[PDB]
C-alpha cells in the first residue's frame, strides 16, 4: 500500500501479495473489500434518497402592472435553486473526502492484523510488507490471510534464523 | 518468503473534488448529474401534447379564425406554446 | 420527463438541462459536474 497500489490485483479493493517456493501471486481480502463496498454503497444511496423528486413545475405570466409579483416569483425560484445547488455540491465534497479516508483506514487495518499475527516470526520491512524468519508454504500464507496463524509453531525456527 | 499488504489500482481517469484537494483521480465513481437530452418534444407515457402552433392561449380559447386546427383537440398531456 | 429543451431518459437525482419540467424529473441544479468517488485513489506502483 506504500508507494501505490497493485494493478495486478483485480478481484477486490484490498488484498495480499505473497512470495514463496511454490510461486507468487495476488489475492483479494474479501471480508475487507465487501465491507468497504457495502459501506460506500449505502452512502451513495443515502445521498440520492435524501433528495426528493422534482414534480411538474411551470412558470407564470404577469401583467404590466404586476411587476412586483413577477419579481417576487422570480426571487423565490432563484433563491431555492441557489440553496439546492449549494446543498448538492457541498454534500458531494464532504462525502468524497470521507470516502477516501475510509479506504486508507481499511488497508492500514489489514497491515496491522497481519503484523499482530506474525509478531517475532517475521521482519517488518517498512514498505507495508513482512519477511518471514522461517520457511513458509502456501498453507501458512493462507493461515495468515485467514487470521488463524499459529505463532508458537514457528517460534523456534524463527529465533534460530534471527540469531 | 513474504506477505505484502496492498490495494487495487487501474487505468481510470475519473476525477473528483474533495474539500482539501481538487482533481483527485479515482478507480471508481458515480455521476449524480444528468446533462443529456433528446432535443425534441415527446409523448408522455403514450400521450401527445397539444401544440398551439402560432396561437396564444387567448387565440386558442376565443377561437381566433386561424386556430381552426385546434377546435377538435379535446385532450392532451401538456400544452406547448 | 419532458423539459422545454428536450426529453430526459435518466435515473440520476439531478439535471442541468432546464428548471421547467413536466413528468417525473431530476432536480434542476446550477452545476456542471457532480460526481462521487466510490473507489480508491488511483495511484498504481
Amino acid at each position, epitope marked *: 500500500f506504500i508507494e501505490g497500489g497493485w494493478t495486478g490485483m483485480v478481484d477486490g479493493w484490498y488484498g495480499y501479495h505473497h512470495q514463496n517456493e511454490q510461486g507468487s501471486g495476488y489475492a483479494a481480502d474479501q471480508k475487507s473489500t465487501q465491507n468497504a463496498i457495502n459501506g460506500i454503497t449505502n452512502k451513495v444511496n443515502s445521498v440520492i434518497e435524501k433528495m426528493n423528486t422534482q414534480f411538474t413545475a411551470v412558470g407564470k405570466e404577469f401583467n404590466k402592472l404586476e411587476r412586483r409579483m413577477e419579481n417576487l416569483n422570480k426571487k423565490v425560484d432563484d433563491g431555492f435553486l441557489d440553496i439546492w445547488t449549494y446543498n448538492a455540491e457541498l454534500l458531494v465534497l464532504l462525502e468524497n473526502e470521507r470516502t477516501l479516508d475510509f479506504h486508507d483506514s481499511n488497508v492500514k487495518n489489514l497491515y496491522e492484523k497481519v503484523k499482530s499475527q506474525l509478531k517475532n516470526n517475521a521482519k517488518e520491512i517498512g514498505n507495508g510488507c513482512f519477511e518471514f524468519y522461517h520457511k513458509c508454504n502456501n498453507e501458512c500464507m493462507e493461515s495468515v490471510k485467514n487470521g488463524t496463524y499459529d505463532y508458537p509453531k514457528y517460534s523456534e525456527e524463527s529465533k534460530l534464523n534471527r540469531e | 518468503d513474504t506477505i505484502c499488504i496492498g490495494y487495487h489500482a487501474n487505468n481510470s481517469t475519473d476525477t473528483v473534488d474533495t474539500v482539501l484537494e481538487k482533481n483527485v483521480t479515482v478507480t471508481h465513481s458515480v455521476n449524480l448529474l444528468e446533462d443529456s437530452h433528446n432535443g425534441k418534444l415527446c409523448l408522455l407515457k403514450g400521450i401527445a401534447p397539444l401544440q398551439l402552433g402560432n396561437c396564444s392561449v387567448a387565440g386558442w380559447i376565443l377561437g381566433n379564425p386561424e386556430c381552426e386546427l385546434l377546435i377538435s383537440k379535446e385532450s392532451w398531456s401538456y400544452i406547448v406554446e | 420527463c419532458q*423539459t422545454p429543451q428536450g426529453a430526459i431518459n435518466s435515473s440520476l437525482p439531478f439535471q442541468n*438541462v432546464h428548471p421547467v419540467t413536466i413528468g417525473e424529473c431530476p432536480k434542476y441544479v446550477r452545476s456542471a459536474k457532480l460526481r462521487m468517488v466510490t473507489g480508491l485513489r488511483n495511484i498504481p506502483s
Partner: antibody, heavy 126, light 107 residues
Framework: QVQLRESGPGLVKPSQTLSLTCTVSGDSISNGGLYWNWIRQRPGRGLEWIGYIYYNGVTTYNPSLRSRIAISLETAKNQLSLRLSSVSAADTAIYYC??????????????????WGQGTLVTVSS | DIQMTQSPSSLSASVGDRVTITCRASHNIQNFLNWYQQKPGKAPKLLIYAASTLQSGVPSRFSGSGSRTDFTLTISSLQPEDFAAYYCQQSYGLPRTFGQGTRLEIK
C-alpha cells in the same frame, strides 16, 4: 484547441444548390451534446442565422428559409453540412459554422456561440 | 421573431474615451444576451457571454449589463484595436437574431 473550417466552391450559378461543409477538429460532434450552427453575412449587412443541428440529428431552421435549407451531420468525419436549394443573387454571403456552448443558469442553459470558424465567401453569378 | 435593436448605428470616439453601445429587445429575453466583436474580414469574436460576463481572453476593458429588454455594452479606455462592428445576439428563442450592428470608429 477547437477549430472549425468551412469549405466549398465559392461560386454557384443561379438555380443551383449551394453546398458547404464544415470540418470540426479538437472536439467531437458525437460526444459534446452541443448544437452546431450555420450563419451567414450578406455584404454590407449584419449577421443572419441559418439554422442548427444537434447531436441526435435534430434540426431546426430559420423559418424564412426553411423550405430551401437542409442541414445535416456526419459524426464519423466530424463534419457538418449545409445545402441551399434554388440559389439566387440574394444568397451572396460569407457563410460561417459555429459551435454553441453553454453554462447552466437561472432559467436553464444559457447558450452562446464561441468557436466561429473562418468564413467562406460564396458568390452567386453567371 | 424577437427583434434586437442597437443604437447608435455608428459611433466614433477617441482613444482613451468611453464608449457605450446599447441594445433593446422587443421581448423579455432575461439573461440570454451575447455580444460579439467583428473585425473587418473576420468571423465575429465573443466578448460577452451572459449579459454580464466575459469570455476568457477578452480584455478587462469590456463590460456589460442588462435586465429583460434593455442591455448595454461598455468599452472603457478605448484602444485602436477596438475598431470593430459590434453585434447584439439573443439566445432565448430558437430563430436566433442579431441586431443590425454598431460600427465603432476611432477618433
Amino acid at each position: 484547441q477547437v477549430q472549425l473550417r468551412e469549405s466549398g466552391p465559392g461560386l454557384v450559378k443561379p438555380s443551383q444548390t449551394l453546398s458547404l461543409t464544415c470540418t470540426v477538429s479538437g472536439d467531437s460532434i458525437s460526444n459534446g451534446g452541443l448544437y452546431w450552427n450555420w450563419i451567414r453575412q450578406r455584404p454590407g449587412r449584419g449577421l443572419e442565422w441559418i439554422g442548427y443541428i444537434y447531436y441526435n440529428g435534430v434540426t431546426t431552421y430559420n423559418p424564412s428559409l426553411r423550405s430551401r435549407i437542409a442541414i445535416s451531420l456526419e459524426t464519423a468525419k466530424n463534419q457538418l453540412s449545409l445545402r441551399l436549394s434554388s440559389v439566387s443573387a440574394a444568397d451572396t454571403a460569407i457563410y460561417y459554422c459555429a459551435r454553441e456552448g453553454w453554462v447552466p443558469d437561472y432559467g436553464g442553459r444559457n447558450y452562446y456561440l464561441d468557436f466561429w470558424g473562418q468564413g467562406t465567401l460564396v458568390t452567386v453569378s453567371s | 421573431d424577437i427583434q434586437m435593436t442597437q443604437s447608435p448605428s455608428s459611433l466614433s470616439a477617441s482613444v482613451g474615451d468611453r464608449v457605450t453601445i446599447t441594445c433593446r429587445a422587443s421581448h423579455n429575453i432575461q439573461n440570454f444576451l451575447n455580444w460579439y466583436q467583428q473585425k473587418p474580414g473576420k468571423a465575429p469574436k465573443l466578448l460577452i457571454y451572459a449579459a454580464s460576463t466575459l469570455q476568457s481572453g477578452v480584455p478587462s476593458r469590456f463590460s456589460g449589463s442588462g435586465s429583460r429588454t434593455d442591455f448595454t455594452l461598455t468599452i472603457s479606455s478605448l484602444q485602436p484595436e477596438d475598431f470593430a462592428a459590434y453585434y447584439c445576439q439573443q439566445s432565448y428563442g430558437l430563430p436566433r437574431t442579431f441586431g443590425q450592428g454598431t460600427r465603432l470608429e476611432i477618433k
